[PDB]
């Protein structure tokens, strides 16, 4: 398939050896579906390889946790709250109270004020997800209007939206902003503390491993491939 | 009219031969206009078809002001043509502002007024050697007059506030030559005020020499004034001033012969 | 038995014709012999001439008898057919392209000792194209490589080679007079020439004979450059130059005495190495200064070497990354791999995957294989558009990003027939988004180029409007701003929005002098329907 | 007569002044000549007193070949002049082939030549329209054609010679300008021949007519061919023409109303 067969599914070696057996549950495995393979050293090996499916939602979700608003109360209760450095403008948004644009004006180290800009004070079975850099990725929402009012909207006040994405790796960091509309705005917050939740969490494509069983007669596993495990072990530890 | 008609539909196909050209090798909208500002084969026939639309513009905008030429504008204005195009080109590489969008259309921009401005003076001599005037040219030579003297004005003041925002460029070159003929205008404009007054009277006008002579000679004092401090700015300016020269010489040609007119007058 | 013992010699024939002739009628009479060793199952002769028949070099280009002795060289055990055979299961060259044999027949390449399977696994591994993207996993094969190409080609042998872009050829287009310049005496003719004929380059071959007798005469010149080359020639000995530390090291002596940066790398390293004189480390470091303090490439990645490894100066690994680090800028490929040897060790740098592998990647991005885009390049000039794409489709998946963009490029204006005109668009959108996720801005482009006409894909704004925004925020191509206005002022994707459309108009003026013109042309007809709507009013 | 005089003294004089203040600060002959070669306003004076001593010898040239000015040669002289000094320096601004003393001295020399030839044409032409001649007059004009002549063929040997030996540059401008002012002699001196031969005859010479819209066409298809050329030559070339245009109009227009008389006429 072309959309997400493209490159998008991951595929393991492993080496089970002679005696073994194909898994029944998840991927599915055909006996014809094989190739038979020789190392360089004669070493015999047929590898029995998976008809992609990588598909349906049989995960057995099963989630008595939390809300998602009740992982985001200790973010909004810190009152530790991000920024973002632009070219000239900076965004900031505060989790669940505020939300501020500005830059501030700077003559020869004379100016003193500042462009004050608000953007919003924060006085269904499916979760929404968004594409994020063309990979769908779900998040939770949450609106905040009642800004600066917008000048070429008919004095309308400006309207916010808060857009939360699991991150494990990220400390609660503004992604990127953009404006739908102008006066409109959405932020993606890349935040760990919302990941426990499995719906919320980083989507995984399964991986379809292959089994390189052994011929009967060579070892479980090549020899050129356990002196390579050797060396990168030992490479490894020390460093 | 037919013979510039072939003229406007051989360039109107071939104008579209060379955008239909860029709209074959980039397909959208941003790398063929892009392509088209690079390449300059294609950018040699857009000018010339801003030429042919600005000849025919030009034959559109001189029948509102002027009927018909009368056989001897059309050779003045053609000798007069011929240095004009060789001073403009002139003065543009010399410059070393290079050939751009923005300095080839302001410079043709001056030769379009330039080219009326001088049909409308041999207009202003047949004026008073015309006898027959009607309602309708009085009014439009007093609608070629208010065209030229605010245009004048306008190009005069942004090119002198183009001086105090950068300094030193060809902008004061073409700013000067607009304020010579911003005088020709109101030069124009006297002497159309001058026969229309001579035109009320039913008399022979004593003054209308006087006064005529009085106009040259404030002419030709503005005009060397205003050459005088050209030639001084461009002498301590990075390119010699070359340029016009021969205009400034038939500016005082004819001064000359306006102060000695005026001389052999009072004496 | 007999015929193993002519087949042999068959290759060897061929093989010798191979290496001394570079004509193009002379290589292939070399694979006229080899060719005959083919059909007697020469092993060796196997490996060389499945490639010559499937990349259309040296041979004419047939996949169908390339796919067939790559499955006899499989059942044998050979590294290199098993890594070949792969590359045709991944990209469906006379086969149905299934990426789970691709990845069986790499891995055992891989095994077997190939440094293309060890390429392509450590950019797969790298980029998680097929597999999961892992540091640990895309360090192990990329090292392998690293190690060889440090070790065997780093001043020993050497390709520099031009890697150039069609795309970027297209909207910008890129040696007789050089050689008569340096007919008339002029000595930096003679240099330049003389570089390019004992280095090559710019589309002219390697001649070791011809660039010693062109030194030579800039060396009676007095040039301070051709002083320290023709040292460098007799010290590190060719065929035509013997090598001899003796003559090669006076000279040396003498063009660091007056002027020479290159001299004095060379005068230094003869001190320091021990050839022919005795080893002095203070006079090495002390001449060395002076050739990183000059600029010498050589020379700064010289001095860190003698304090990474603590031969001369105490082991500041503050210092010694500090030379790696500005020799790294410079171009050479050893501040390359002993930068990434210490950033994966962990030493001097604390110990980083990510900046190890991206290291890792610029070494092995110049090997022997590297020529190839050369090859792929040149047969793209000679109108064979099927022997191109498939040199440009193997190095496209070794992980280079000029060959994921010029065999996406060949195969976007649909000129490669050796794919159906039926797959030639997702195999093109495939290397765009390779391409593009390596920090390439027309992939970007083309990648919502494709999403916004359906070209492979189903017609989808929403995707094609994020891929020109990321174009505009990370490398702020002025297309993808004025593209982006579009969208704005038409509604397609994203809500429309007149005021936002003028906003990234205006924003492609700035970011680029090309774009007043057609900025100028799409804000008056923005202003026009802003007329047109105040008359409805 | 005297405002010649009284101006060529003044730039005598400013040249004076000039060289004595460059040989004010500067004693040896050689610093002298360098710093006088490295001052804008020496050079200037210069080139002024080079043009009012080119002035005088062309005054003096224009004596000793015409008897007197017929006070609408001299002003077709002073509108052609008028014309060829802008033309020369927008193909010496064109033309990007630096400011250097080298070429200024030769496109004087052409541009004396060219007032030469139009002086010579219309001195066909009024003796032409003239019923009573001079042997003194003829034999100046033949001296003056012979003279122009061989200039001409010299100066076009010269610059072909240029163009092959070196390349691409305004020798080819000026072998163009050499090969046209050669055509032009030719013409002349057939349409003196056909003035002499009707002239030497006491009736009107019926075939004369003929035969000068023939000697016409013939001049008007070489003038084609060597415009065609130039413009070729142009277009190959990598900077812009620019330079006459106007010339080549003024041939195309006189060429097609020649054969649209013979035409007429046949
Ligand atoms: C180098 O330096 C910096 C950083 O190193 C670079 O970023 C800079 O590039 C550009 O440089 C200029 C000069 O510093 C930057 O300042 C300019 O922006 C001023 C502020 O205006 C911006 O924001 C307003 C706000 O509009 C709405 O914004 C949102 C809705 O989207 C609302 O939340 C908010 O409340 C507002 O309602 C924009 O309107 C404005 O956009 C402007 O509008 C037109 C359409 O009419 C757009 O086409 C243009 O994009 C235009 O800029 C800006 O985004 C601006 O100054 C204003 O106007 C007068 C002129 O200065 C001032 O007198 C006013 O006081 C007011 O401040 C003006 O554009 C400044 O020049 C600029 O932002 C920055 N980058 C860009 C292009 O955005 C580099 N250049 C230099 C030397 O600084
Ligand atoms: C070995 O060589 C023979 C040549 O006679 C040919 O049939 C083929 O190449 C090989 N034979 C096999 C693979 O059975
Ligand atoms: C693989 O491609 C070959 C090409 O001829 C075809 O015969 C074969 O059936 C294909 N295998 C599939 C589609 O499983
Ligand atoms: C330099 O001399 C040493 C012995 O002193 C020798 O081993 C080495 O090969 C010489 N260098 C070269 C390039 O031959
Ligand atoms: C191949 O192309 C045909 C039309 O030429 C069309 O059926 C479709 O695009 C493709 N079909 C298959 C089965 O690949």
Not at chain 1, 87 to 99: D, F, L
Not at chain 2, 218 to 225: A, E, N, Q, R
Request: a neutral charge.
């Amino acid at each position: 398939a072309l959309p997400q067969l493209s490159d998008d599914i991951p595929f393991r070696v492993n080496w089970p050896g002679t005696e073994f057996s194909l898994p029944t549950t998840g991927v599915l495995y055909k006996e014809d579906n094989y190739v038979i393979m020789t190392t360089a050293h004669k070493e015999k090996y047929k590898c029995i390889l998976p008809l992609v499916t990588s598909g349906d939602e049989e995960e057995e979700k099963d989630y008595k946790g939390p809300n998602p608003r009740e992982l985001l109360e200790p973010l909004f209760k810190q009152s530790s709250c991000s920024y973002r450095i632009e070219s000239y403008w900076t965004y900031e948004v505060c989790h669940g109270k505020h939300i501020r644009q500005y830059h501030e004006e700077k003559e020869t180290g004379q100016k003193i004020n500042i462009h004050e800009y608000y953007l919003g004070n924060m006085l269904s079975n499916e979760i929404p997800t968004k594409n994020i850099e063309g990979q769908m990725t779900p998040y939770y929402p949450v609106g905040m209007g009642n800004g600066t009012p917008c000048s070429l909207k008919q004095n309308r006040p400006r309207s916010s939206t808060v857009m939360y994405i699991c991150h494990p790796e990220s400390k609660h960091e503004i992604l990127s902003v953009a404006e739908v509309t102008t006066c409109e705005y959405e932020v993606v917050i890349l935040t760990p503390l919302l990941c426990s939740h499995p719906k919320y969490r980083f989507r995984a494509s399964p991986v379809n491993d292959i089994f390189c069983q052994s011929l009967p007669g060579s070892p479980f596993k090549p020899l050129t491939l356990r002196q390579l495990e050797q060396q990168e072990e030992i490479l490894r530890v020390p460093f | 009219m037919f013979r510039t008609a072939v003229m406007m539909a051989a360039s109107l196909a071939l104008t579209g031969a060379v955008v239909a050209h860029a709209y074959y090798l980039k397909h959208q909208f941003y790398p063929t206009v892009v392509y088209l500002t690079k390449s300059s084969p294609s950018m040699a026939v857009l000018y010339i078809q801003a030429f042919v639309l600005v000849f025919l513009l030009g034959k559109v905008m001189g029948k509102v002001f002027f009927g018909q030429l009368r056989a001897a504008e059309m050779e003045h204005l053609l000798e007069r043509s011929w240095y004009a195009v060789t001073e403009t080109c002139l003065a543009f590489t010399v410059f070393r502002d290079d050939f751009s969008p923005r300095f080839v259309a302001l410079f043709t921009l001056l030769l379009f007024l330039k080219c009326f401005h001088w049909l409308a003076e041999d207009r202003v001599d047949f004026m008073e050697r015309s006898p027959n005037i009607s309602w309708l040219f009085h009014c439009r030579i007093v609608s070629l007059m208010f065209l030229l003297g605010i245009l004048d004005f306008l190009f005069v003041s942004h090119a002198y506030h183009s001086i105090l925002t950068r300094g030193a460029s060809v902008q004061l070159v073409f700013g000067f030559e607009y304020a010579i003929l911003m005088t020709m205008v109101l030069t124009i404009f006297i002497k159309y005020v001058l026969h229309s007054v001579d035109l009320q009277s039913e008399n022979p006008w004593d003054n209308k020499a006087v006064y005529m002579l009085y106009t040259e000679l404030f002419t030709g004092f503005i005009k060397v004034l205003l050459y005088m401090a050209f030639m001084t700015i461009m002498i301590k300016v990075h390119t010699f001033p070359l340029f016009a020269i021969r205009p400034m010489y038939l500016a005082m040609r004819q001064f000359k012969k306006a102060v000695t007119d005026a001389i052999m007058s009072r004496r | 038995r007999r015929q193993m013992q002519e087949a042999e010699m068959m290759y060897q024939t061929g093989m010798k014709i191979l290496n001394g002739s570079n004509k193009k009628s002379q290589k292939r009479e070399a694979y006229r012999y080899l060719q005959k060793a083919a059909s007697m199952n020469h092993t060796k002769a196997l490996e060389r001439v499945s490639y010559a028949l499937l990349f259309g070099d040296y041979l004419p280009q047939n996949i169908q008898a390339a796919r067939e002795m790559f499955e006899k060289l499989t059942e044998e055990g050979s590294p290199k057919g098993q890594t070949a055979l792969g590359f045709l299961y991944a990209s469906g060259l006379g086969v149905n392209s299934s990426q789970a044999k691709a990845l069986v027949y790499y891995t055992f390449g891989a095994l077997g000792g190939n440094l293309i399977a060890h390429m392509v696994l450590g950019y797969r591994y790298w980029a998680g194209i097929g597999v999961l993207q892992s540091c640990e996993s895309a360090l192990t094969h990329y090292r392998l490589v690293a190690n060889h190409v440090a070790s065997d080609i780093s001043l020993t042998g050497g390709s520099v080679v031009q890697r150039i872009r069609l795309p970027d050829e297209v909207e910008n287009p890129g040696i007789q007079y050089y050689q008569f310049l340096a007919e008339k005496g002029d000595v930096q003719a003679q240099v330049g020439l003389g570089q390019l004929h004992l280095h090559g380059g710019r589309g002219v071959e390697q001649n070791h004979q011809r660039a010693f007798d062109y030194f030579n005469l800039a060396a009676n010149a007095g040039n301070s450059h051709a002083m320290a080359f023709l040292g460098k020639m007799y010290s590190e000995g060719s065929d035509i130059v013997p090598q001899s530390n003796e003559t090669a090291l006076h000279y040396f002596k003498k063009a660091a005495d007056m002027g020479n940066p290159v001299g004095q790398s060379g005068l230094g390293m003869a001190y320091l190495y021990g050839r022919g004189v005795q080893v002095n480390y203070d006079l090495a470091l002390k001449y060395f200064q002076k050739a990183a303090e000059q600029g010498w490439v050589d020379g700064q990645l010289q001095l860190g070497s003698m304090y990474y490894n603590g031969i001369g100066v105490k082991r500041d690994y503050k210092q010694a990354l500090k030379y790696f680090n500005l020799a790294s800028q410079g171009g050479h490929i050893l501040a390359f791999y002993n930068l990434a040897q210490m950033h994966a060790s962990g030493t001097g740098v604390m110990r980083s995957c990510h900046t190890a592998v991206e290291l890792f990647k610029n070494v092995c991005e110049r090997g022997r294989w590297s020529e190839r885009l050369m090859t792929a390049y040149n047969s793209y000039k000679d109108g064979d558009y099927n022997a191109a794409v498939i040199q440009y489709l193997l190095l496209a998946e070794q992980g280079y990003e000029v060959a994921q963009s010029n065999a996406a490029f060949i195969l976007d204006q649909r000129e490669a027939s050796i794919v159906g005109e039926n797959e030639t668009y997702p195999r093109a959108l495939l290397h765009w988004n390779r391409a593009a996720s390596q920090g390439y801005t027309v992939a970007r482009i083309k990648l919502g180029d494709y999403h916004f006409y359906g070209f492979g894909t189903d017609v989808d704004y929403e995707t094609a409007f994020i891929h020109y925004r990321l174009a505009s925020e990370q490398q702020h191509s002025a297309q993808a701003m004025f593209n982006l206005g579009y969208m704005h002022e038409k509604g397609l994707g994203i809500k429309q929005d007149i005021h936002l459309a003028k906003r990234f108009y205006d924003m492609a003026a700035e970011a680029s002098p090309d774009a007043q013109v057609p900025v100028f042309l799409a804000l008056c007809k923005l202003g026009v329907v802003y007329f047109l709507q105040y008359i409805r009013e």
